[PDB]
Amino acid sequence: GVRTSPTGEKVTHTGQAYDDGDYRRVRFSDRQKEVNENFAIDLIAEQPVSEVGSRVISCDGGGGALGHPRVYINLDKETKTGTCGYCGLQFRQPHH
Amino acid sequence: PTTKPPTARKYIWTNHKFNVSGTPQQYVPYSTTRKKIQEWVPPSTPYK
Amino acid sequence: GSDRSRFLEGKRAVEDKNIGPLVKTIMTRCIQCTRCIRFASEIAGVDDLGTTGRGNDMQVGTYIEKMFMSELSGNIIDICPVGALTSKPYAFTARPWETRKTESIDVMDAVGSNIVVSTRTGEVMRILPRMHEDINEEWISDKTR
Amino acid sequence: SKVKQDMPPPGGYGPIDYKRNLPRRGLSGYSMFAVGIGTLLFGYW
Amino acid sequence: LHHALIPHGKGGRSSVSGIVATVFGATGFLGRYVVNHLGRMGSQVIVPYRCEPYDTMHLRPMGDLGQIIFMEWNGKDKDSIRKVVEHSNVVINLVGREWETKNFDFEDVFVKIPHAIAQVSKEAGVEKLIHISHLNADIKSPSRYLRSKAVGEKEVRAAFPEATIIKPSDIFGREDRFLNYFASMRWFGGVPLISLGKETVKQPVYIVDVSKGIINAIKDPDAKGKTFAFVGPNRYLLFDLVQYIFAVAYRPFLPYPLPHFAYRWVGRLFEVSPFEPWTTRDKVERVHMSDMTLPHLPGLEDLGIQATPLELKAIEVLRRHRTYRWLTSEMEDVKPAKTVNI
Amino acid sequence: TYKFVNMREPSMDMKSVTDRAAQTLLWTELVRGLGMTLSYLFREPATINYPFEKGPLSPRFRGEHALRRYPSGEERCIACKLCEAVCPAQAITIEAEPRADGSRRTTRYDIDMTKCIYCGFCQEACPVDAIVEGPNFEFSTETHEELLYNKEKLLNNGDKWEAEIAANIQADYLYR
Amino acid sequence: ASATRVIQLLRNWASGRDLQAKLQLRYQEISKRTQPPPKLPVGPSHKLSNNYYCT
Amino acid sequence: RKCDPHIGLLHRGTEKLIEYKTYLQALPYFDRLDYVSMMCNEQAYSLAVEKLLNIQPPPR
Amino acid sequence: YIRPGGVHQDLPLGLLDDIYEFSKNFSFRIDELEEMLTNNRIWRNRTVDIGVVTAEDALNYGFSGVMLRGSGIQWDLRKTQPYDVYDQVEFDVPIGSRGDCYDRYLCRVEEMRQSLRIISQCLNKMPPGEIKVDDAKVSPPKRAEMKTSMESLIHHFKLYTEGYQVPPGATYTAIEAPKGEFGVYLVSDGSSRPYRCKIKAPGFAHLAGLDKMSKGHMLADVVAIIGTQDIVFGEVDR
Amino acid sequence: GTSVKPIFSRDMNEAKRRVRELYRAWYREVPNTVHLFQLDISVKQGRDKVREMFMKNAHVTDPRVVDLLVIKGKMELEETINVWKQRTHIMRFFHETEAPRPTDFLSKFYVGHDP
Amino acid sequence: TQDTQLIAVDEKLDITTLTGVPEEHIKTRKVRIFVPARNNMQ
Amino acid sequence: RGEYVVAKLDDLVNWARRSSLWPMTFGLACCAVEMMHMAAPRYDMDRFGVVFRASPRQSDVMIVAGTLTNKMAPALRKVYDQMPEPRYVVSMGSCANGGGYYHYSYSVVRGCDRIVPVDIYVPGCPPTAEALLYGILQLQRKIKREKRLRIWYRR
Amino acid sequence: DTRPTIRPRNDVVHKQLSAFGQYVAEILPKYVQQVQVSCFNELEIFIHPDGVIPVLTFLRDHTNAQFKSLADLTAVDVPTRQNRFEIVYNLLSLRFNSQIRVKTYTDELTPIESSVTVYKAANWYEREIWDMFGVFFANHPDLRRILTGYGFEGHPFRKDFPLSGYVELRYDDEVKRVVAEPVELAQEFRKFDLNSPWEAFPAYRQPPE
Ligand SMILES: NC(=O)C1=CN([C@@H]2O[C@H](COP(=O)(O)OP(=O)(O)OC[C@H]3O[C@@H](n4cnc5c(N)ncnc54)[C@H](OP(=O)(O)O)[C@@H]3O)[C@@H](O)[C@H]2O)C=CC1
Ligand code: SF4
Ligand code: SF4
Ligand code: SF4
Ligand code: SF4
Ligand code: SF4
Ligand SMILES: [K+]
Ligand SMILES: [Zn+2]
Incomplete structure (x- = not known):
């Protein structure tokens, strides 16, 4: 979800938004900023949480060799769905 | 592609752009980082 | 070290003990060298961490949840040979080869602890406790780092 | 699955020519001179 | 200063000086040199261009990456100005046409647009403005060059309270159409000037002295409101220009005191060519008119910029006119013109 | 083993001198040169009709960096910065920061197109195949600035191509 | 390929060689651009035993 | 009679940057050394480095 | 492509056949070159007997490759100092008699034919084997092993941060470039980065000879000297 | 270890000697290098x-x-005499484009953190 | 041990003028040494 | 109408210039060889105007191919001024664009912008031979969108 | 050498260079300081500065050595050592297909009489050394700045010379000519600290000095 600034300046996922007083905004008129509308924060948020009944789940991320190293995910935290640092896919432990 | 459609994904562009240079749709370099040295925002009203 | 692997089975993942908003624990990376527990009980002189478990399942931590809070608490980060314990604020910010270490002394205390500054591209990332023995050895308190 | 990298066929490959094979084309040295003189005599006549 | 407007660097190409000098009409002479000076220590000089981008292409090398931001603009369009000076912390006016155009009445080039850019700049939120007047600016003078200059000079003065108005004398440079001009009577004819030159004393000034004046006026805070006059080191009676210029170029000296009556006719005939009015009726009495002393307003000398003598650098503009037999001749072979001055 | 080159000997007999004299007077090797070019005139040309015809390439082509994304949607680059360390021209400029979710994500990923060399080292660096060189070469520009790429352009390039480069690494990761 | 017969003998004669036997443009001898999965071999020392880096 | 082939008009301090980079990043310099026979330069660099390393390349 | 410790990537499937397709016909095009150039009297009279150089003068000037072999000198790097597998392959060394620009030109085109011979033998000699050394400290581990095993992860990580630790010392490993003798004086301090690498420029001495090969000769012979030297402005200028 | 090999200057006078004709040639060199190279710089x-x-x-x-500066200055002169050096090279000694670096501690202070 | 018209140089060697570094970069540049402290994490 | 007349003249002049450039080669490094393959029949450029007339005086566009050095700096520059207008320069490859692989070096100026006004930039190290043909084509269309006679009419 | 990772050693010629090294050492012991060979069958005999003439004149003319192919004239700066500049020769024997290499030590000022007599190939190399490292050589025919820019300052491969340099160039309109301003980089060279603090090779380790 891209957000706009008061001067109509759409913000990027990093949060950069040049204010009106910034002289560095003059390259922006007559032209445009390229904004990755697919904000990386919310195309992972809508992804569901898979249910695997094990204490440690591999996280290859699909594609076999095409993915991220198979860092093993610890699954015993009931209050925290264990997510992978590489791909961010949240993994869960069946509700006992 | 008529005999082999590319792997359909959500983030893929639904419409392939040309070389946008020359047109007002050009690209302009700009810092994508955030400023990390904020000022003191001096408070107002009284005098020493 | 070798140049390949011979492991075919799975691995073991440890629950990340959560202590401090200042030091981050990834306990799966721990090699159980127990340097943290000794630098705690002898140097810091405070009972904070343990080695709960047994065998492959023995884990370095506090069992019951706590928040280790010593004045020199930001020192176990450097003693840790692996990234099992890392610095939360500096985390995911800069990496060795970018940094150009510059040495100076601490000012937050009257000790004047010798420290190493970690400018990367025009700003300070992390503070390292330069070894000099008399003033600070190679340990600095949290308020300085 | 065995090794599948790019390999030459078991018979290797067709024997590839590499000699200097400039084909000698032309006419006899006297023949070129004779035909040159013959055209001149015909032209003169 | 603004969060990023704060200056930084050793005055190099990639050093931010914090001055955002949107110059108006920089595609000629003084515009070329000021941007060269503006871009030397590094500054976001937004140049609104109106001609073909090709003719503006040569301004690119004197700016760092992302510095010379050419912007489309039109004089008539009110919003055209407001877009190019919206973020510019300083505005340097340079608009003006020394010759005449049917679509651009001579009033406009010194009254309409100069007023049309001064009020928008003050409405935008700028700090400074520098509109370039003439050292001889005088409406009552028969010079439409002077007549339009003076009225526009006070308009921007009235419109902009901090309008640091600059009134340089007859500037000279590589493309000044003043030195290369005065070399051109030999090509055109027998030097049809008035009264053999013994009726007009002028004080030429080298452009870099002028251009260094504005940038020094930029850093000077007290320059606001004050109306500095940029004057050369020495004056020069008109005849001395003609013989000296014909000397530093090794041209056949053919002076002729053609009176003002017939010399006015050749002005319109030079405007007859519907591509460029080589000489105009305004330019007829422009050179006949002499330069007033104007001693009360401050000059560049007290501003830190000295004045370079004309005879110090003439062939730098005039070696082009020197023929092959004498292209190698420098100042020293040529006698200096009689310094009729203070 | 070796071999001379200019060791031919001219025969002095009546026959041999006649051919050489005929060659000198009646230019024959010159005509032989003429015949070579003329035979090539009637040879079909090999002029690729750009842009309508385009030259062949291989699934390994290197150019036009573009960050990719996982099938879920999150971008691949975890800011492991091996590409930065490897980059032999130091065209890459990466600054990391802990994202609000918790995992890393580069807040600044500029690769200067006119410092880069398209050596293909960067794809071999990141183990998450984050940055790759796409098949594009049709990004010539008219201003030096637009060559200076950033994170936003890199992602936009990735989303633009993705599908083409998705099959490219599928047919090449066996070799790698 | 392409060309016709009478043209071939023209360039065959002018060059004194048979150009139709082998030319300088690829028509059909080119290997298929898409190829089967290239199962690569392993290293000579790829073994779970007696391969210490001490050797 | 006398000839002086002045050079430097392309000069780049190739090994000056080679010192600051490591061996792998140094490899593209060699490909750009001779812009005619490029991989032959790669051959010389690879032989030199693996000669110091006391490691021979595989027969393939 | 060619990196310390083997070759980076493997040959794509079917490419070896394409090499055979090209090699089978490239012999024809060189017959076209030799017919167009060698026999024509214009090429000889303009280029033969031009820029001669005696064998002792050539070698003592630091010349190499086509400079020596063309000018009578009997020496080639592969035949004498066999580096890599060049000993196994067979070829001929086309040395010249006089050693002018023309003789060097013929020496180049005969090496072209000899190059085709070497291509023929090696292409039919392709082994079953890996592309890079089985030492992860010098060669990057396989991408399949990259994301599977920890040792491979570290070894590629460190190899791609600082590289590899090269034992100290120095060497002058030199091989013949298709232009001349190309060598490097790679002295290593022992860190992960080189200390000093002075690259032998094969044209460095070759361009030094422009003084005499153009001496006593026409102005147009100067470019003929350059052409037969094939002066490439990347090595003589570093 | 104070005793070391000399290049040309066995004593100070020979060093003073070589400086002499070096200036003799260079003093005789300034007027023409301007003349041929079309430099807009007076001889003085x-x-x-x-x-x-x-x-x-x-x-x-x-x-x-x-x-060593004698031979360095010696050969900087040789490169100039025979039109090898161009307009940019001769002018390069005549520093033009940069503003004077600061003189008073006030000017050091006002520019930046540089000393 | 090296007798070839050797000059008894009693003054400390000053090669600063040959290297031709800018004058602002030879005086206004404090130059310092030390042996690096070990990276405490390593 | 007058604007139509100046439009037809603008098209006639623009179509001639864009379609018949006479580039002059200024290759200095490996960027020269790959453009020099555009001369090879695979990506023939003489198919559209750009021909062998060379003769830097008789040249419209200059292609600066390869690394630019400080000692090369003035001699290249003086070529540019002697080159009659309409003169445009094409920046070939990472080195001529912004210094590329030798950006941090003492004998190279970072980019040709510091010397000549660059009208078009072709990335690559080296750019593929056909990619320059595109760069020439996009420069050709750049000339197509030129309003020299139009802008004169407004004046 | 059944293992294919390490390169095989070759002992027969390894002993041969050492025998030849002693053979050269005994003949001219006035100038040979020390001689040694490495693992990769590369012998190096070390000479004194004033020894450029006879040692090469030896190798160039000896009936049993006859090393005539001059390979390269390199220099290696070592700031620690007093004679930091180390001029390195390299010769190849045509008949005996071997590579000799002689190197000396030299200060910034101390000269070397030009070895153009033994090898005129050194002449053109000799220009580069004074350009590239700056070491002047005595009685050289014409020792010129040939590879660096015209009127350059200093010696770039002295390890005290910045990689970026001291002067940058640009075309300036107000002078219509290229002006050499001091460098002002758009980006600073991000140096990388690439030195593992653990022992790399116990073999070549320097003992406590
Ligand atoms: N000696 C002298 O010549 C002196 C001159 N002046 C004044 O200084 C100013 C600049 O001088 P100089 O630089 O030499 O002049 P030039 O003729 O070289 O350049 C004038 C500039 O004004 C711009 N301009 C003028 N009118 C318009 C308009 N209506 N719309 C858009 N742009 C416009 C031109 O743009 P474009 O090129 O696109 O038309 C051009 O950039 C002029 O007003 C001049 O009279 C002051 C004192 C002395
Ligand atoms: S110091 Fe680190 S590695 Fe060692 S036991 Fe403690 S957490 Fe584990
Ligand atoms: S860097 Fe070290 S501590 Fe961190 S994951 Fe890798 S091996 Fe473990
Ligand atoms: S291709 Fe090479 S130079 Fe370009 S960004 Fe990747 S690693 Fe850097
Ligand atoms: S190497 Fe790949 S994963 Fe690492 S920072 Fe670069 S793009 Fe991201
Ligand atoms: S951009 Fe690349 S190919 Fe072009 S000159 Fe520079 S290094 Fe060579
Ligand atoms: K740690
Ligand atoms: Zn995962």
């Missing part, structure tokens, strides 16, 4: 440019180095 400020270059380094006392 060309001559004393050589002058203050000459004592911009005339402070060292080691005889081994002074003659």
Whole structure:
């Protein structure tokens, strides 16, 4: 979800938004900023949480060799769905 | 592609752009980082 | 070290003990060298961490949840040979080869602890406790780092 | 699955020519001179 | 200063000086040199261009990456100005046409647009403005060059309270159409000037002295409101220009005191060519008119910029006119013109 | 083993001198040169009709960096910065920061197109195949600035191509 | 390929060689651009035993 | 009679940057050394480095 | 492509056949070159007997490759100092008699034919084997092993941060470039980065000879000297 | 270990000697280099440019180095005499484009953190 | 041990003028040494 | 109408210039060889105007191919001024664009912008031979969108 | 050498260079300081500075050595060592297909009489050394700045010379000519600290000095 600034300046996922007083905004008129509308924060948020009944789940991320190293995910935290640092896919432990 | 459609994904562009240079749709370099040295925002009203 | 692997089975993942908003624990990376527990009980002189478990399942931590809070608490980060314990604020910010270490002394205390500054591209990332023995050895308190 | 990298066929490959094979084309040295003189005599006549 | 407007660097190409000098009409002479000076220590000089981008292409090398931001603009369009000076912390006016155009009445080039850019700049939120007047600016003078200059000079003065108005004398440079001009009577004819030159004393000034004046006026805070006059080191009676210029170029000296009556006719005939009015009726009495002393307003000398003598650098503009037999001749072979001055 | 080159000997007999004299007077090797070019005139040309015809390439082509994304949607680059360390021209400029979710994500990923060399080292660096060189070469520009790429352009390039480069690494990761 | 017969003998004669036997443009001898999965071999020392880096 | 082939008009301090980079990043310099026979330069660099390393390349 | 410790990537499937397709016909095009150039009297009279150089003068000037072999000198790097597998392959060394620009030109085109011979033998000699050394400290581990095993992860990580630790010392490993003798004086301090690498420029001495090969000769012979030297402005200028 | 090999200057006088004709040639060199190279620089400020270059380094006392600048200055002169050097090279000594670096501590302070 | 018209150089060697570094970069540049402290994490 | 007349003249002049450039080669490094393959029949450029007339005086566009050095700096520059207008320069490859692989070096100026006004930039190290043909084509269309006679009419 | 990772050693010629090294050492012991060979069958005999003439004149003319192919004239700066500049020769024997290499030590000022007599190939190399490292050589025919820019300052491969340099160039309109301003980089060279603090090779380790 891209957000706009008061001067109509759409913000990027990093949060950069040049204010009106910034002289560095003059390259922006007559032209445009390229904004990755697919904000990386919310195309992972809508992804569901898979249910695997094990204490440690591999996280290859699909594609076999095409993915991220198979860092093993610890699954015993009931209050925290264990997510992978590489791909961010949240993994869960069946509700006992 | 008529005999082999590319792997359909959500983030893929639904419409392939040309070389946008020359047109007002050009690209302009700009810092994508955030400023990390904020000022003191001096408070107002009284005098020493 | 070798140049390949011979492991075919799975691995073991440890629950990340959560202590401090200042030091981050990834306990799966721990090699159980127990340097943290000794630098705690002898140097810091405070009972904070343990080695709960047994065998492959023995884990370095506090069992019951706590928040280790010593004045020199930001020192176990450097003693840790692996990234099992890392610095939360500096985390995911800069990496060795970018940094150009510059040495100076601490000012937050009257000790004047010798420290190493970690400018990367025009700003300070992390503070390292330069070894000099008399003033600070190679340990600095949290308020300085 | 065995090794599948790019390999030459078991018979290797067709024997590839590499000699200097400039084909000698032309006419006899006297023949070129004779035909040159013959055209001149015909032209003169 | 603004969060990023704060200056930084050793005055190099990639050093931010914090001055955002949107110059108006920089595609000629003084515009070329000021941007060269503006871009030397590094500054976001937004140049609104109106001609073909090709003719503006040569301004690119004197700016760092992302510095010379050419912007489309039109004089008539009110919003055209407001877009190019919206973020510019300083505005340097340079608009003006020394010759005449049917679509651009001579009033406009010194009254309409100069007023049309001064009020928008003050409405935008700028700090400074520098509109370039003439050292001889005088409406009552028969010079439409002077007549339009003076009225526009006070308009921007009235419109902009901090309008640091600059009134340089007859500037000279590589493309000044003043030195290369005065070399051109030999090509055109027998030097049809008035009264053999013994009726007009002028004080030429080298452009870099002028251009260094504005940038020094930029850093000077007290320059606001004050109306500095940029004057050369020495004056020069008109005849001395003609013989000296014909000397530093090794041209056949053919002076002729053609009176003002017939010399006015050749002005319109030079405007007859519907591509460029080589000489105009305004330019007829422009050179006949002499330069007033104007001693009360401050000059560049007290501003830190000295004045370079004309005879110090003439062939730098005039070696082009020197023929092959004498292209190698420098100042020293040529006698200096009689310094009729203070 | 070796071999001379200019060791031919001219025969002095009546026959041999006649051919050489005929060659000198009646230019024959010159005509032989003429015949070579003329035979090539009637040879079909090999002029690729750009842009309508385009030259062949291989699934390994290197150019036009573009960050990719996982099938879920999150971008691949975890800011492991091996590409930065490897980059032999130091065209890459990466600054990391802990994202609000918790995992890393580069807040600044500029690769200067006119410092880069398209050596293909960067794809071999990141183990998450984050940055790759796409098949594009049709990004010539008219201003030096637009060559200076950033994170936003890199992602936009990735989303633009993705599908083409998705099959490219599928047919090449066996070799790698 | 392409060309016709009478043209071939023209360039065959002018060059004194048979150009139709082998030319300088690829028509059909080119290997298929898409190829089967290239199962690569392993290293000579790829073994779970007696391969210490001490050797 | 006398000839002086002045050079430097392309000069780049190739090994000056080679010192600051490591061996792998140094490899593209060699490909750009001779812009005619490029991989032959790669051959010389690879032989030199693996000669110091006391490691021979595989027969393939 | 060619990196310390083997070759980076493997040959794509079917490419070896394409090499055979090209090699089978490239012999024809060189017959076209030799017919167009060698026999024509214009090429000889303009280029033969031009820029001669005696064998002792050539070698003592630091010349190499086509400079020596063309000018009578009997020496080639592969035949004498066999580096890599060049000993196994067979070829001929086309040395010249006089050693002018023309003789060097013929020496180049005969090496072209000899190059085709070497291509023929090696292409039919392709082994079953890996592309890079089985030492992860010098060669990057396989991408399949990259994301599977920890040792491979570290070894590629460190190899791609600082590289590899090269034992100290120095060497002058030199091989013949298709232009001349190309060598490097790679002295290593022992860190992960080189200390000093002075690259032998094969044209460095070759361009030094422009003084005499153009001496006593026409102005147009100067470019003929350059052409037969094939002066490439990347090595003589570093 | 104080006794070391000399290049040309066995004593100070020979170092003083070589400086002499070096200036003799260079003083005779300024008027023409301007003339041929079309430099817009009068002869006078060309001559004393050589002058203050000459004592911009005339402070060292080691005889081994002074003659090294002699040959360095010697051959900087040779490269100029035969139109090898161009307009940019001759002018390069005549520093033009940069503003004078700061003189008073006030000017050091106002520019930036630089000393 | 090296007798070839050797000059008894009693003054400390000053090669600063040959290297031709800018004058602002030879005086206004404090130059310092030390042996690096070990990276405490390593 | 007058604007139509100046439009037809603008098209006639623009179509001639864009379609018949006479580039002059200024290759200095490996960027020269790959453009020099555009001369090879695979990506023939003489198919559209750009021909062998060379003769830097008789040249419209200059292609600066390869690394630019400080000692090369003035001699290249003086070529540019001697080159009659309409003169445009094409920046070939990472080195001529912004210094590329030798950006941090003492004998190279970072980019040709510091010397000549660059009208078009072709990335690559080296750019593929056909990619320059595109760069020439996009420069050709750049000339197509030129309003020299139009802008004169407004004046 | 059944293992294919390490390169095989070759002992027969390894002993041969050492025998030849002693053979050269005994003949001219006035100038040979020390001689040694490495693992990769590369022998190096070390000479004194004033020894450029006879040692090469030896190798160039000896009936049993006859090393005539001059390979390269390199220099290696070592700031620690007093004679930091180390001029390195390299010769190849045509008949005996071997590579000799002689190197000396030299200060910034101390000269070397030009070895153009033994090998005129050194002449053109000799220009580069004074350009590239700056070491002047005595009685050289014409020792010129040939590879660096015209009127350059200093010696770039002295390890005290910045990689970026001291002067940058640009075309300036107000002078219509290229002006050499001091460098002002758009980006600073991000140096990388690439030195593992653990022992790399116990073999070549320097003992406590
Ligand atoms: N000696 C002298 O010549 C002196 C001159 N002046 C004044 O200084 C100013 C600049 O001088 P100089 O630089 O030499 O002049 P030039 O003729 O070289 O350049 C004038 C500039 O004004 C711009 N301009 C003028 N009118 C318009 C308009 N209506 N719309 C858009 N742009 C416009 C031109 O743009 P474009 O090129 O696109 O038309 C051009 O950039 C002029 O007003 C001049 O009279 C002051 C004192 C002395
Ligand atoms: S110091 Fe680190 S690695 Fe060692 S036991 Fe403690 S957490 Fe584990
Ligand atoms: S860097 Fe070290 S501590 Fe961190 S994951 Fe890798 S091996 Fe473990
Ligand atoms: S291709 Fe090479 S130079 Fe370009 S960004 Fe990747 S690693 Fe850097
Ligand atoms: S190497 Fe790949 S994963 Fe690492 S920072 Fe670069 S793009 Fe991201
Ligand atoms: S951009 Fe690349 S190919 Fe072009 S000159 Fe530079 S290094 Fe060579
Ligand atoms: K740690
Ligand atoms: Zn995962």
